[PDB]
Coordinates of C-alpha atoms in Angstrom, one line a residue:
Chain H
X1 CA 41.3 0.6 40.5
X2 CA 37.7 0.4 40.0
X3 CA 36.4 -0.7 36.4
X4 CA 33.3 0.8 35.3
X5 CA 30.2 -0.6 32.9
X6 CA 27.5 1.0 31.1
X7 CA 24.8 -0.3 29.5
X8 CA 22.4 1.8 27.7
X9 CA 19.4 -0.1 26.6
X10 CA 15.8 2.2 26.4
X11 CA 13.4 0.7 24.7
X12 CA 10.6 2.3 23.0
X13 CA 7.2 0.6 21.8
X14 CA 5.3 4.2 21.9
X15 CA 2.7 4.7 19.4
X16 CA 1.3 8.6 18.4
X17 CA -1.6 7.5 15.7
X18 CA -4.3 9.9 14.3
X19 CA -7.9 8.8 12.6
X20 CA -10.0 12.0 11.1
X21 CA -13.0 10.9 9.6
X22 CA -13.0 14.1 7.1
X23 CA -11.1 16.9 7.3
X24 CA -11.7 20.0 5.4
X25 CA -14.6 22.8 4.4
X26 CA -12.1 25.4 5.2
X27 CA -12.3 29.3 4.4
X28 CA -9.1 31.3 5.0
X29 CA -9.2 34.7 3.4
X30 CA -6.0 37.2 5.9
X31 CA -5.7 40.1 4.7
X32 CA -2.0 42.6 5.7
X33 CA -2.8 46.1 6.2
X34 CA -0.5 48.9 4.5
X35 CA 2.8 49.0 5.9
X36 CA 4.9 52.5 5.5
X37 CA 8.6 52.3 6.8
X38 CA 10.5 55.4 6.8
X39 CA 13.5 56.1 8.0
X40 CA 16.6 58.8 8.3
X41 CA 19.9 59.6 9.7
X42 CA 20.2 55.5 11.6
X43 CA 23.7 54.4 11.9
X44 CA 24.6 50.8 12.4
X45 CA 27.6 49.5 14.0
X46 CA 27.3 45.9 14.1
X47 CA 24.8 43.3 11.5
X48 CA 21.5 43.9 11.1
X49 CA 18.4 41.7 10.1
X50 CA 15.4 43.7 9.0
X51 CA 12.2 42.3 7.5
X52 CA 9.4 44.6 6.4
X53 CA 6.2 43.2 5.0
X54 CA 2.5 43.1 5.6
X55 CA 1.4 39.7 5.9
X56 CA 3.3 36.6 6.6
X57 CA 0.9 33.8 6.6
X58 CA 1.4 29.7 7.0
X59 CA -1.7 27.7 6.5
X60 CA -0.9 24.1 7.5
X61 CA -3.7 21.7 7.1
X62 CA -2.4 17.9 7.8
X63 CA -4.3 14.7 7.1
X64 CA -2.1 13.7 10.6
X65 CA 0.3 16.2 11.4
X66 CA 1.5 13.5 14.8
X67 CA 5.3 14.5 16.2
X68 CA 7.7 12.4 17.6
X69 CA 10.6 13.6 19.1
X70 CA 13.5 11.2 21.4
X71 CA 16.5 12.8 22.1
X72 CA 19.3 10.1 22.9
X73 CA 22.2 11.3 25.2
X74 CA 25.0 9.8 27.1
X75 CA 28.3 11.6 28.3
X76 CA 31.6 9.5 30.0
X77 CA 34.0 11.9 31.8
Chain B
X1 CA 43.9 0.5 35.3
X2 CA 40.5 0.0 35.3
X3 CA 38.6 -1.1 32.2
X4 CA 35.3 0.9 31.0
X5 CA 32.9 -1.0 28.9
X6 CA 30.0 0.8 27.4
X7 CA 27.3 -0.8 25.4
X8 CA 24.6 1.5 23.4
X9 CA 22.0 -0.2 22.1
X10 CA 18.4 1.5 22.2
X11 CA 15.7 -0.1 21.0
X12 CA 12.7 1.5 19.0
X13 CA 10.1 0.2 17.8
X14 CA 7.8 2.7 18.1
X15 CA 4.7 4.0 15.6
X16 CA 3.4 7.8 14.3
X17 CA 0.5 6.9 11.8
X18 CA -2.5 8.5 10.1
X19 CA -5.4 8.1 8.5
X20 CA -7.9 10.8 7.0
X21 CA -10.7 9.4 4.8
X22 CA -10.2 12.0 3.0
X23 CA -9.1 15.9 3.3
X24 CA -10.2 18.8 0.9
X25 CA -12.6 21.6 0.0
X26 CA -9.9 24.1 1.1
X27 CA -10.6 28.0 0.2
X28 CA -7.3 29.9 0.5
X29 CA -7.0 34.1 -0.4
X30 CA -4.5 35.5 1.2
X31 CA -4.1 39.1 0.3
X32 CA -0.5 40.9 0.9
X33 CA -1.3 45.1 1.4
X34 CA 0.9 47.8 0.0
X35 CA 4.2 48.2 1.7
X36 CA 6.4 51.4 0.8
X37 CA 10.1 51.6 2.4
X38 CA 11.7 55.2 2.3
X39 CA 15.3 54.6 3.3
X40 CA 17.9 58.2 3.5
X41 CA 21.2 59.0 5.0
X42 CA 21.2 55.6 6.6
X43 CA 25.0 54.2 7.6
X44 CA 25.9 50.6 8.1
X45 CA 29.6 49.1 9.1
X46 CA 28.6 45.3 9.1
X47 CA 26.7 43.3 7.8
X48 CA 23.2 43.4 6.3
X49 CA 20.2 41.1 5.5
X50 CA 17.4 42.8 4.4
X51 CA 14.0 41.5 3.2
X52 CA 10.7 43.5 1.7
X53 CA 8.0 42.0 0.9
X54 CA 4.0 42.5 0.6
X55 CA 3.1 38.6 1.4
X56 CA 5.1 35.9 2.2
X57 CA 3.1 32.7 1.7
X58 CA 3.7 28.9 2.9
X59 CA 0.6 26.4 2.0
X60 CA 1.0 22.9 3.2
X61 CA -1.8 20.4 2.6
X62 CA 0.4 16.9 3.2
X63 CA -2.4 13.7 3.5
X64 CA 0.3 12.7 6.2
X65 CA 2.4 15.4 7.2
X66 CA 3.7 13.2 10.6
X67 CA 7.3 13.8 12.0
X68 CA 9.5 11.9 14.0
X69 CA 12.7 14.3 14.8
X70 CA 15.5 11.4 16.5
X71 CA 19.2 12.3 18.0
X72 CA 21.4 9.6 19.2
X73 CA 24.4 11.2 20.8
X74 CA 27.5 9.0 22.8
X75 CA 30.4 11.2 23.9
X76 CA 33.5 9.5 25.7
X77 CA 36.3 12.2 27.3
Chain N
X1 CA 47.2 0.2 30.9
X2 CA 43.2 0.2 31.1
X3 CA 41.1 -1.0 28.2
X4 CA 38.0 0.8 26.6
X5 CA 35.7 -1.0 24.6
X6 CA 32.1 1.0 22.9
X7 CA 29.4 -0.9 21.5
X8 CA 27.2 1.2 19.6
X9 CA 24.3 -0.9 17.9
X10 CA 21.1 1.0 18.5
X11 CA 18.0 -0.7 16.9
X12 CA 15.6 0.7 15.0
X13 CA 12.4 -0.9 13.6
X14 CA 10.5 2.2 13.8
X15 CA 7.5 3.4 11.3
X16 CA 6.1 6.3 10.0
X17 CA 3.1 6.0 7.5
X18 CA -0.5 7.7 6.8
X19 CA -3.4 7.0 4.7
X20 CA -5.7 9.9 2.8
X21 CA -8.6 8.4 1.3
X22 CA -8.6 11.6 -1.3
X23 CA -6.7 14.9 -1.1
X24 CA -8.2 17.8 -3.4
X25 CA -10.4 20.3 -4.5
X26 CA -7.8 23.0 -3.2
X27 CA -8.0 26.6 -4.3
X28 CA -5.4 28.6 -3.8
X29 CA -5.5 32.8 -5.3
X30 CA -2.2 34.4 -3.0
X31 CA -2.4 38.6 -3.8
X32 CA 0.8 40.1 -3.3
X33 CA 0.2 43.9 -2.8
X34 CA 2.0 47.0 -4.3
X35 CA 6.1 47.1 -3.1
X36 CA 7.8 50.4 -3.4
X37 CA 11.0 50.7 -2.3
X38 CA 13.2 54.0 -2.0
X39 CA 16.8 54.9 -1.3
X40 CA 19.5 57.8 -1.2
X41 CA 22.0 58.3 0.4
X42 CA 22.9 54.7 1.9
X43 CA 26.7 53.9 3.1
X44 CA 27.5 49.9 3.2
X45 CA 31.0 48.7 4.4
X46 CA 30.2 45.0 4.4
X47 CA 28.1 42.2 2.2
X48 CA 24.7 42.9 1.6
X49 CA 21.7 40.6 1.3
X50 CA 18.8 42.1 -0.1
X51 CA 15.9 40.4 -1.1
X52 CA 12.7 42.9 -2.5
X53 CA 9.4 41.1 -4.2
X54 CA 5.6 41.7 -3.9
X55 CA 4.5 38.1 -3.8
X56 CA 6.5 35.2 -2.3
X57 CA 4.4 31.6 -2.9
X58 CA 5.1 28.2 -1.4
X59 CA 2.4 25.6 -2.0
X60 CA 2.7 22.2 -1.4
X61 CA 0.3 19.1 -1.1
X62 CA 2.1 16.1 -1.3
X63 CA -0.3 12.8 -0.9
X64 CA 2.4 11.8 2.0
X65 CA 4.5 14.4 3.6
X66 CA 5.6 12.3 6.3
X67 CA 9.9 13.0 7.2
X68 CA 12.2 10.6 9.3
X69 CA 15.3 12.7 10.5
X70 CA 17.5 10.8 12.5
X71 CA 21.5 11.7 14.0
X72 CA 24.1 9.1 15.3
X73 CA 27.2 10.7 17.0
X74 CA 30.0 9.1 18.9
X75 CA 32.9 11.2 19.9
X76 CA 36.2 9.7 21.2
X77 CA 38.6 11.6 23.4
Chain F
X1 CA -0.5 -39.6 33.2
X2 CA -1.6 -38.8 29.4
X3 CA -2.4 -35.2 28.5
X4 CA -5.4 -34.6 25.8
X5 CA -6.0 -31.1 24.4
X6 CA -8.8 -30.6 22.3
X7 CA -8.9 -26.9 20.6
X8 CA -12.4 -26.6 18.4
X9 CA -13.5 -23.3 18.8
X10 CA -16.0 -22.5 15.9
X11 CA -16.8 -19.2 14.6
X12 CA -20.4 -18.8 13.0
X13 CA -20.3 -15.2 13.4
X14 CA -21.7 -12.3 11.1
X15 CA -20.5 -9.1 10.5
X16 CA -22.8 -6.8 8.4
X17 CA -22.5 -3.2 7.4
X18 CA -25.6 -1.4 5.9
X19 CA -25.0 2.2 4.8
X20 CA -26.5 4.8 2.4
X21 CA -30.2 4.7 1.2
X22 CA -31.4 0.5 0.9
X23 CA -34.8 -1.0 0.0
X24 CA -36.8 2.5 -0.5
X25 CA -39.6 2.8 -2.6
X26 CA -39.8 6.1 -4.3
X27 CA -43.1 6.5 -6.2
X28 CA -43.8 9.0 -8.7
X29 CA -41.2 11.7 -7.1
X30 CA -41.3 15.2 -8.5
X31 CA -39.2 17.9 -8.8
X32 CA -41.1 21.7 -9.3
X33 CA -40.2 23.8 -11.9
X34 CA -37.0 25.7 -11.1
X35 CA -36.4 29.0 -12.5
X36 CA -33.1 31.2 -11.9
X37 CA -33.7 34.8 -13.7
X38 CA -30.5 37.0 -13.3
X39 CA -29.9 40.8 -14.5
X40 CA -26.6 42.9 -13.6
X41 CA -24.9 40.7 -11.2
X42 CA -21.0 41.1 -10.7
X43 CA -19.0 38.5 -8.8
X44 CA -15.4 39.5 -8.0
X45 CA -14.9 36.2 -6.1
X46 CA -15.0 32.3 -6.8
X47 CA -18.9 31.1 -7.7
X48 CA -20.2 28.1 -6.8
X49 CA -23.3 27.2 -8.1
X50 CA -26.1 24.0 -8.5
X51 CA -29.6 24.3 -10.0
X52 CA -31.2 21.0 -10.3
X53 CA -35.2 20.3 -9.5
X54 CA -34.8 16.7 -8.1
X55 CA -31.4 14.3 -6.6
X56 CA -30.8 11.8 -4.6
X57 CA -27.7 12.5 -3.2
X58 CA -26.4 9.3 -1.6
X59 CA -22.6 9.9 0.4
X60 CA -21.0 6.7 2.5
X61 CA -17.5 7.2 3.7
X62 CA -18.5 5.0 6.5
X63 CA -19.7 1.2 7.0
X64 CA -16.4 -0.2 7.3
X65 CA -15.6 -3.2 8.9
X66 CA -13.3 -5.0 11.0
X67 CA -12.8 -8.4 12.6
X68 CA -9.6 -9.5 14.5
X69 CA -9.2 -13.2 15.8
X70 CA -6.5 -14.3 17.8
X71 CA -6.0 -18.2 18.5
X72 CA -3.3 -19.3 21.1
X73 CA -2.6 -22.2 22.5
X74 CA 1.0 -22.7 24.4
X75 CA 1.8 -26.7 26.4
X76 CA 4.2 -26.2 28.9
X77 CA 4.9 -22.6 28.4
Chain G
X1 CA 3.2 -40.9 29.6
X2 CA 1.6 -39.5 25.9
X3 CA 0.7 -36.0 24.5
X4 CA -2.3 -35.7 22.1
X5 CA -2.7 -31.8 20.9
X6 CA -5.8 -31.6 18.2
X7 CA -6.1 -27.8 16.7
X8 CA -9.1 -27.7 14.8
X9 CA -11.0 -24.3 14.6
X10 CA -13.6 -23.5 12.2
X11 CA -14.1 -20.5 11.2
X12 CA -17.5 -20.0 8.6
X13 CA -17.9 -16.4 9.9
X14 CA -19.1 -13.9 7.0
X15 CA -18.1 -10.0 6.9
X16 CA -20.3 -7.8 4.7
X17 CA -20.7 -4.1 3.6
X18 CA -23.8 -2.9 1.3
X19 CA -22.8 0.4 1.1
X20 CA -24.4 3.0 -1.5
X21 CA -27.5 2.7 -3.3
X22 CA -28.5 -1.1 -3.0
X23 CA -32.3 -2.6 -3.8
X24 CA -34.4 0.3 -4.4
X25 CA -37.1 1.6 -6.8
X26 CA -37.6 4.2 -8.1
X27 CA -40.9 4.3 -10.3
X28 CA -41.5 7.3 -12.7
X29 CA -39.1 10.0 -11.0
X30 CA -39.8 13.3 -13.0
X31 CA -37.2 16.1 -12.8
X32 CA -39.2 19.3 -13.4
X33 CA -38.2 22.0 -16.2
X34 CA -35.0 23.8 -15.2
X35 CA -34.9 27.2 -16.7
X36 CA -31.5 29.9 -16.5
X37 CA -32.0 32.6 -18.0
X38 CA -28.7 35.1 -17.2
X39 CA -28.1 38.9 -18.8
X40 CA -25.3 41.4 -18.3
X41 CA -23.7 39.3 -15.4
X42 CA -19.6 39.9 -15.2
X43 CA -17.1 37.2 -13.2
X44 CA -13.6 38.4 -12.4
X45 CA -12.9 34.5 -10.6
X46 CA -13.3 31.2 -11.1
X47 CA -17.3 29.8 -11.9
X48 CA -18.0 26.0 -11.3
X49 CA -21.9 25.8 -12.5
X50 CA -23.8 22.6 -12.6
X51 CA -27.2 23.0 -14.0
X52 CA -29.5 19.3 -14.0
X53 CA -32.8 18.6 -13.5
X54 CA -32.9 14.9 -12.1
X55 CA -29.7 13.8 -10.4
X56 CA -29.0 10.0 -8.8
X57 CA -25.1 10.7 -6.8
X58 CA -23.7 7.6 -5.3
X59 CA -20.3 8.1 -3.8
X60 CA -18.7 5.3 -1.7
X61 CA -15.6 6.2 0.1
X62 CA -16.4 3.8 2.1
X63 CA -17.8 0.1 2.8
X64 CA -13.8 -1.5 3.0
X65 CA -13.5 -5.0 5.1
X66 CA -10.5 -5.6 7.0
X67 CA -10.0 -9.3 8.5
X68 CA -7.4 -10.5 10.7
X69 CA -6.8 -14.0 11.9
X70 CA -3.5 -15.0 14.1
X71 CA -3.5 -19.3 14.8
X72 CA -0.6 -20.0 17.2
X73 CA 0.6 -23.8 18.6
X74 CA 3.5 -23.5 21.1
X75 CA 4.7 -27.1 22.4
X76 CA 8.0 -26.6 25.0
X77 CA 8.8 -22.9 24.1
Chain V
X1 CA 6.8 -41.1 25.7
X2 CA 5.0 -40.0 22.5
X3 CA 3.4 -37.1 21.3
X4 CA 1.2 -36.3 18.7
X5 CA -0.1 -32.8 17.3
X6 CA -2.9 -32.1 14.4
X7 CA -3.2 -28.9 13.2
X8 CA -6.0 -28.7 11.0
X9 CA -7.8 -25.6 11.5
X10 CA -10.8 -24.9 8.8
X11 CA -11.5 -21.4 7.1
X12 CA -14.8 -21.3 5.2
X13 CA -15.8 -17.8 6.2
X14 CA -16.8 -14.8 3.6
X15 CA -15.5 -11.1 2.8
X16 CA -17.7 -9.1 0.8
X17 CA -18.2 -5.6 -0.4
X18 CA -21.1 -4.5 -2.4
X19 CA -20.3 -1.1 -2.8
X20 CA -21.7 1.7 -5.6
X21 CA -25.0 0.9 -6.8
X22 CA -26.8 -2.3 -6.6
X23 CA -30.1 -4.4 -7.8
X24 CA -32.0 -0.9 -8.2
X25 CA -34.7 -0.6 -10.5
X26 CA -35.1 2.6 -12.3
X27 CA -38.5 2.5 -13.8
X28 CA -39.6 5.1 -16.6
X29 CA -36.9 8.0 -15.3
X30 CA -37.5 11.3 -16.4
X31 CA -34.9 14.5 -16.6
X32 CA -36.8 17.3 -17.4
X33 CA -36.8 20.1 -20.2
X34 CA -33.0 22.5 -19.8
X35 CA -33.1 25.9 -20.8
X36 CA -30.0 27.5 -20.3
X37 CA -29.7 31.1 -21.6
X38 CA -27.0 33.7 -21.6
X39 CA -26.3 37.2 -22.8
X40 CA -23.9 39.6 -22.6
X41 CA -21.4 37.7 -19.8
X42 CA -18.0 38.3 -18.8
X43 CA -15.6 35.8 -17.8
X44 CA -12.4 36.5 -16.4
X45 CA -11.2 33.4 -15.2
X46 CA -12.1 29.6 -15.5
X47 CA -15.6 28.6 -16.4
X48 CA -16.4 25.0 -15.5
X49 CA -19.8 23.9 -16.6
X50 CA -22.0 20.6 -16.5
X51 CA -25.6 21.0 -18.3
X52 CA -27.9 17.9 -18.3
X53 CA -31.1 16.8 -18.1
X54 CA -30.7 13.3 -16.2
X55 CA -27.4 11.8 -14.7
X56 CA -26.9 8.3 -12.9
X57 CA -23.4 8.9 -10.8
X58 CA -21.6 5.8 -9.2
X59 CA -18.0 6.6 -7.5
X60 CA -16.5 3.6 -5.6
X61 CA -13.4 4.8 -4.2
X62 CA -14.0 2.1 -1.6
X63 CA -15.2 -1.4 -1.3
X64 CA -11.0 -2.7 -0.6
X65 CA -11.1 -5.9 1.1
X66 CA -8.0 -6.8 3.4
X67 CA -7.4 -10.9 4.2
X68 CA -4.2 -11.3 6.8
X69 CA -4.3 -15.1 7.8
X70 CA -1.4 -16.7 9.8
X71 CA -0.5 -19.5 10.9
X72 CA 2.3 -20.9 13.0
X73 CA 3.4 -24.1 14.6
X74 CA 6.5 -24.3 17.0
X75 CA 8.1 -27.6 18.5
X76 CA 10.1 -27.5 21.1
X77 CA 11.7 -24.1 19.8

């Protein structure tokens, strides 16, 4: 009966490196329209998620903003 | 019987950097319009989440803002 | 019977840094717009979440920003 | 056999940034007469505003330097 | 059967930044006459206003120096 | 046999920032006559003002110096 051995050993010397030399002058100014929601007579049997709104908005201005991402996996029998 | 042997041992030595000299003059208006929601005679069995809103706002001005995300996962029988 | 022997010993010498030489002159005016909500006649027969606002704000400038989330799992028979 | 190593590298080397205004002659400069007459003006928004008849506006993120200097020396590896 | 290592480098290098305003003249500079003369004017937002009428701005952001120097002597590992 | 190593490596080299301003001559400067009149304004919001005649402004956010130096000698492990 056969043993067996594993060896797991990756190695990472990765770099992910960002130089800006300014970052900015930025104008952002969205604007929702109206929203009007009506409703009658619905019947729901199972949950519900509603969201009702008229502007979702993310402004997202990084000096770097770099992503890594290592994902690690090992499965025996 | 067989023996099993498993040796885990990644190695990281990796980077995520970054440099802005520098980051500003940012002008940010956002403007939600009107929302109105006329609900009537509506029936629910299970559950609800329900959200209204004129503007939903996230403004994220790190001077890094890098990620690194990492999973290291061994499963054995 | 058959031995089983796991060495888990990952290595990490990892980094995650940034440099902003300045980080201001931000202006920031969110406008939530008018909410009007209206109900009769609504049946519920399990929790309800409800969440009702004009004007929902995040803002956040952090001289940094930079996250490090990292998982170890090992799972034995 | 006898081994000698000699290892005299010399550096005499310069490495000089010059940035912005240097060594200008500015004789006798002059700035007009500067005359900003406002009647019934509305602003319903952020203002940003400079008057001024004469500047010297100087602005140096740059003229950075950098010197790297490796020395190796390895006898029988 | 002899060894004679000699590790002698000179380093007189020079690194320099003159970054800004640096040896100039300026000989009689004159702003002119700044005049702001403002009726009936309404502002529903912020107002930043700078009024001068001779201006000298230096800003340095800049000019850094970064020197690196690594000496290595390796004799049988 | 016999062996012998000298390590005497020489640093006489310079690092120098001369950042901002420097060794100007500002002969007989002259801000002009400011007149700054108002009636009858309406301010909703934040009023930042700056009213002057002459102004000599020197930032130095920069001008760092950095000196890494090593040095290492290894014998036979």
């Amino acid at each position: 009966g056969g043993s067996v051995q594993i060896v797991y050993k990756p190695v990472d010397l990765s770099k992910v490196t960002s130089k800006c030399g300014s970052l900015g002058n930025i104008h952002h100014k969205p604007g929702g329209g109206q929203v009007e929601v009506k409703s009658e007579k619905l019947d729901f049997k199972d949950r519900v998620q509603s969201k009702i709104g008229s502007l979702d908005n993310i402004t997202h201005v990084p000096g770097g903003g770099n992503k890594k991402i290592e994902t690690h996996k090992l499965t025996f029998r």
